[PDB]
């Protein structure tokens, strides 16, 4: 499954 | 293509701030006036301020409209409208309904964030998916998949596909394939008059 691609820290 | 120009110029970097420190990064694609397309899952994060192209704002500086998108649901493409700001080019006329891709056709994603700066990724189309389950157990409706090399931070970037047009904003990806939340020109049009 793909992942949400918002860059999290 | 003046289009690749227009879109590139409307794409602005986004950053979420919590306790003075940057905690998230992505893109925003200006569509008209002071309206920007952005990943909806972006608001699921905790934050104090949102920086759009270097401009810090709080929740009292804009409105965020969601999209009903009918399937058999809330799309991951939200529209963020600033109360005041500097206009962007009106490109709603480059989205569609009056057409549809087809497996294979060239795809171009436009990015502009703080992690990698301005950048472009290319890939090939696949098909339109009604719902896609993410690895965290979540779901997203009306998505267009495509063979591409994407990474965290591209979310919100515009995806383009002889006549060229804008499909929607990048939302998720993985193992060689990317997904963008589709956006209809009419929904943007109806949204334009609503925000006047």
Curated annotation (Swiss-Prot), chain B:
The active site is at 41 (for protease 3c activity), 76 (for protease 3c activity), 155 (for protease 3c activity). Residues 1-188 form the Peptidase C3 domain. It is found in: Host cytoplasm. It catalyses: Selective cleavage of Gln-|-Gly bond in the poliovirus polyprotein. In other picornavirus reactions Glu may be substituted for Gln, and Ser or Thr for Gly. The record marks 171 as: Important for catalytic activity. Cysteine protease that generates mature viral proteins from the precursor polyprotein. In addition to its proteolytic activity, binds to viral RNA and thus influences viral genome replication. RNA and substrate bind cooperatively to the protease. This is Protease 3C.
